[PDB]
Structures are given as C-alpha cells and as structure tokens.
C-alpha cells in the first residue's frame, strides 16, 4: 500500500483512491507533442534520472502517462481523468489522476501543466506512486524571491540552482535587484558588459525553463534627474537598459525607489507611468510594472491612520496597473496582520505586493535565519496578490525559509508554520533531517535589539523547561527530574552539531560551519551551568568553582565569536546561571 509522500506546496484537493502501483521500467508517453514544451522536458529529465525508458510504440503491459493542457484537444486525457477536470480552475491550476496503471496530468494552462509534473515528481519514490485524484491551484498568483539584500550578491551558480529550486516548489517569480550590483543601482545608467550579458541570457533561459518570471530590477533613485533635457536623457537610459534585456527575453520589469534621499513622490510616480505607457503597454507582452516607493513600511507610510505626504501623492499618481510593494508594519517586523494589509491596500485602492524581509540577514550577518514564514496573516490574499521574500546572502540555507514560503503562498489558509518547517527540513536534508532540526531550531529568531525583529522564537520548548527550572529552584521544589531532562537536551545539541560538521555537504556546511561551532560551545556551557546548579544544591564549592570557570570560558568564546545563535536560550541560560539564585 503506497503512501502519499511529503508534498510541497500542499495541494489544495487530494484524495487517495487506491492502493498505489509500481511504475513499469518503460512507459507509454501520450500527448507530449501538443503538451507544454517545458513540462515535457521536466518530465523527461526525471524519467531519465530514475531509469524509466519511454516506449517508441504503445505497449499495453506498461504504465501510461498522459499529459496536456485543457486547451489541447486530446480526448485520451479527458477519458483518463475520470470526471476530474482542470477546466474550471484558476490560472496555473492543474488536475492529476493516478489510477489503474495510468497517470494523467491536465493543466489549466502550460504553467499549470508544469506544476502538475512537479507534483508527479514529488509523488514518486523508487518507482511507486499512490493512486490519487488531485485538483490544485494557487492562492496568490505571484510567488517568489526578490534578490534585494545588501552584501555579497549571489553567484551565477547560486542563481541557476535557486531557479531550478523555485520551479520544483511552484514559485513563479524572481526579482533581480542586488543592492551591491553596481549596474543595478550605484551605476544604473551603465550597460552590462558583454560577458555579464552572457551570464544574463543563461539565467533568463533557465527561468523560462522552470516557469519563473525573471524580473529585471533597476534602482535609479540614487542620482536620477527628472526635468528638461536631463530627465529625458535619464528616462531614455531606463528605456535603453530595459530594451537590451527585453531583447534577450525579459518580460517583467521593476523600478525601485527604496533607501534613497530624494523623496519627489510626483516625479517617481510620473517616471513609472511614462515607462508603463511607452514600454510595458507598447510592447503588449510584458507583465505589469513592479515598484517600491521611498516610503515602504507602514511606520514610514502612515501617521495616525492617515497617509504621509509622499505616500498620499504617490498613491494618487501611480497608475492602477502597477504592482506596488510594501514590507508590512515595519522594515523587519514580527507580523503582518490582516488589518495592516487592509489599511495599505486602502491607501493604494489596489491589491498590494509584499516585500518580506525574512530570511534576509544583511542587518545582522552573524546569525542564520532558518525559520518558517511566521506572523503573516492567513487571510492576507484578500489584500495581497504578489508575495516575495528577501533571502540571505547564504543561498543554500535560504532554501529552508523559501520552502515554507512556497507552501504559504500556494495554499495559504491550510498553512501550518510548524508542519511546513518540519517538512522543509525533512525534504531538503534527508538522512540528516532530525539533527538539522535540532540545530536550525535554535536559529529562527532575528533580533538586532534595535528596529529589526522577526521570525519564530528560538527553541521555545527548551526555553520553557529552563524557565520552569528557575521556578522550581526559587520555589524550593524537587528539580532533579527536570535537570536530567535538561542534561539530555544539551547532550543532543552537541551530538547533532558534531554529526552535521562531519556529514553535511560542503554547500550547506560552508554557510553555517561557524554557527555549529558556536552552538557546541554554548551546549557545553549550558552543561557546566547545570553542574553549577547541582554543586550549589550539594553545597559542594570545589565542584562549583570548577564548573563556574568552564561556564565563563564557554560564554567568553560566544560573546567574542562572529557567529550568533540561540541568544535568548542556550546563551542566556549561561548568563542566567551567573546571577546567584
């Protein structure tokens, strides 16, 4: 009896209708000449990789795969879906049926068929597939990543790997906007050199291959001139630059005004409108223009429930067709409640786009952000139609957070951040999943103790036992049971991190090796901290003085380490223990 494996995103409607069956070593492929070229290629790579030959002629004793779009006239597909249809679903939707030795995929459109194949790829383990009836479609139409952080831009190989990863998780958007690319911002007028344009072409091609909308961003707010000949010339520089990327296949554009000194709301919006009319609309096959205003968090946008000067004028002027992004109540903030999206959607009289600054860490580079989407309201889709996360300069470990963003944006009302977090690590880390959870569990909360705060609290279940222990001691209760529980947790912290150091692939390890060393140190310091409590209860001062020096030794190492992790849990416990009782 074959079970449904981990899926991501969580499909909207899935029922098991059979025991499952084993896919034969050679399959009948049906509808591939009419079906979406990218879907079929994804399917061929998968088949090749899992050693499944495709029959040159029909063989009745071999599994049959039928694939196609609603708008292909292919009846063998309607027959095999067995009353299930993709006809009535929203764009990017699909239907999938596996039953009685046949697998049928029907996409509402091609994007849909590609996503149907991704789910097919996820359902097969070792040639076995469950027998299921699926109809599936996204909550949010635009889902993906804005590469818009400060610091070391992603490499070419980072981005190509990222793009393949988006397609596998049905993320359909990637915005190119690295702050430290000189041609994106510092020197936005200058054309890309020939060799960089060759790298660009590769990224564009891979994007199309994986159904990702590659958005080319530009940030001219540093030094753009708006008026007379200078404003003409500067405007034509935007046109020239977008044209040269259009001519390579780019069909999405963004013009950003964030983090600049000039706050000319009217001029910003007029540039957008002019570009929207002379470029986006003229071309006719270019997707809606994206922007971010110079005021882009509720705090900077709104005062006493009423829009600020910049925002009011910008909202008044910007054409309704342009997507406008905002980061929520602060630049980096715990939550975006429904009421915040309602307010801002109200000022703009339109559905908004989110620029979510998590897991970005450019504001506190010592910590990894390894937690799930957290504090984003599950009804946000009432006011939000475009969702993007800003990742870290660490592309590999950003995958954990993005994985959960794929689930939240595709099936948002079903989204369980703990379940989604667990699934991300299970799917991405495999044999090492259990141990990686132990480590990652301590690295979900970002707090620069100033204005940036976001993410699930660090290992809450452990913080609760620690808190509980200080009560049992100040309350004179028998704590001996809790101390053994806690010794166990600290040993496992050490065990897990040593295992990761030994066994993680370079691609993950090269990104977090320093933080593993830090958590091992703190685990050792928490253990000595308990030894201190034990010795204090035994009025055994020799053991106390010895444990205390070790505790100070481990703490001294962490405070001087670049690495930051478990500030308020593993670290604080040692600081707590060094404060009498």
């Amino acid at each position: 009896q074959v079970l449904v494996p981990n899926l991501n995103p969580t499909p909207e409607n899935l029922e098991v209708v059979g025991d499952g069956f084993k896919i034969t070593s050679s399959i009948n492929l049906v509808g591939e000449e009419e079906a979406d070229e990218n879907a079929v290629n994804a399917l061929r790579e998968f088949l090749t990789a899992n050693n499944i030959e495709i029959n040159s002629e029909n063989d009745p004793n071999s599994t049959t795969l039928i694939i196609g779009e609603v708008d292909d006239d292919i009846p063998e597909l309607d027959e095999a879906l067995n009353g299930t249809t993709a006809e009535n679903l929203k764009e990017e939707g699909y239907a999938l049926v596996s039953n009685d030795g046949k697998i049928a995929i029907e996409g509402k459109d091609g994007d849909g068929t590609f996503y149907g194949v991704q789910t097919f790829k996820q359902l097969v383990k070792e040639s076995n597939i469950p027998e299921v009836n699926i109809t599936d479609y996204p909550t949010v139409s635009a889902r993906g990543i804005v590469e818009g952080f400060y610091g070391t831009p992603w490499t070419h190989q980072d981005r190509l790997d990222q793009i393949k990863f988006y397609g596998e998780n049905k993320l359909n958007t990637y915005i190119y906007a690295p702050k430290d690319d000189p041609y994106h911002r510092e020197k936005w007028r200058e054309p890309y050199p020939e060799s960089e344009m060759q790298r660009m072409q590769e990224l564009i091609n891979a994007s199309a291959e994986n159904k990702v909308d590659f958005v080319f961003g530009i940030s001219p707010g540093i030094d753009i001139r708006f008026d007379g000949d200078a404003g003409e010339e500067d405007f034509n520089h935007l046109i020239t630059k977008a044209e040269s990327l259009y001519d390579m296949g780019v069909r999405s554009f963004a013009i950003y005004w964030d983090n600049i000194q000039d706050k000319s709301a009217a001029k910003h919006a007029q540039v957008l409108n002019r570009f929207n009319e002379e470029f986006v609309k003229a071309k006719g096959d270019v997707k809606p223009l994206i922007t971010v205003p110079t005021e882009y968090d509720t705090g900077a946008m709104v005062s006493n429930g009423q829009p600020r000067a910049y925002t009011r004028i910008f909202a008044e002027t910007v054409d309704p067709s342009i997507e406008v992004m905002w980061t929520g109540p602060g630049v980096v903030t715990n939550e975006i409640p429904l009421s915040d999206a309602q307010l801002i959607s109200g000022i703009y009289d339109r559905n908004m786009a989110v620029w979510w600054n998590y897991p970005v860490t450019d504001y506190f580079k010592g910590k990894l952000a390894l937690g799930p989407m957290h504090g984003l309201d599950k009804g946000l889709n009432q006011y939000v139609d475009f969702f993007t996360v800003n990742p870290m300069e660490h592309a590999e470990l950003s995958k954990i957070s993005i994985h959960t963003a794929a689930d939240y944006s595709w099936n948002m009302d079903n989204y369980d951040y703990d379940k989604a977090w667990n699934r991300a690590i299970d799917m991405l880390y495999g044999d090492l999943a259990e141990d990686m959870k132990v480590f990652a569990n301590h690295s979900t909360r970002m707090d620069n103790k100033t204005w940036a705060k976001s993410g699930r609290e660090d290992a809450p279940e452990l913080r609760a036992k620690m808190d509980e222990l200080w009560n049992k001691l100040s309350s004179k209760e028998d704590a001996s049971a809790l101390i053994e529980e806690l010794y166990g947790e600290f040993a496992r912290m050490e065990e897990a991190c040593n295992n990761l150091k030994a066994n993680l692939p370079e691609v993950a390890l090269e990104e977090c090796s320093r933080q593993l060393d830090e958590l091992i140190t703190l685990a050792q310091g928490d253990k000595a901290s308990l030894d201190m409590i034990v010795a204090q209860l035994n009025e055994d001062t020799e053991a106390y003085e010895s444990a205390k020096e070790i505790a100070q030794n481990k703490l001294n190492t962490a405070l001087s380490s670049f690495a930051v992790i478990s500030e308020k849990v593993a670290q604080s416990f040692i600081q707590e223990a060094l404060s009498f009782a």
């Binding site: 400060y150 964030d258 983090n259 602060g330 630049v331 980096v332 600054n357 450019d362 504001y363 940036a452």
Partner: peptide, 4 residues
C-alpha cells in the same frame, strides 16, 4: 550597510 542595510535599511532603517
């Protein structure tokens, strides 16, 4: 070096 970052926002805010």
């Amino acid at each position: 070096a970052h926002c805010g």
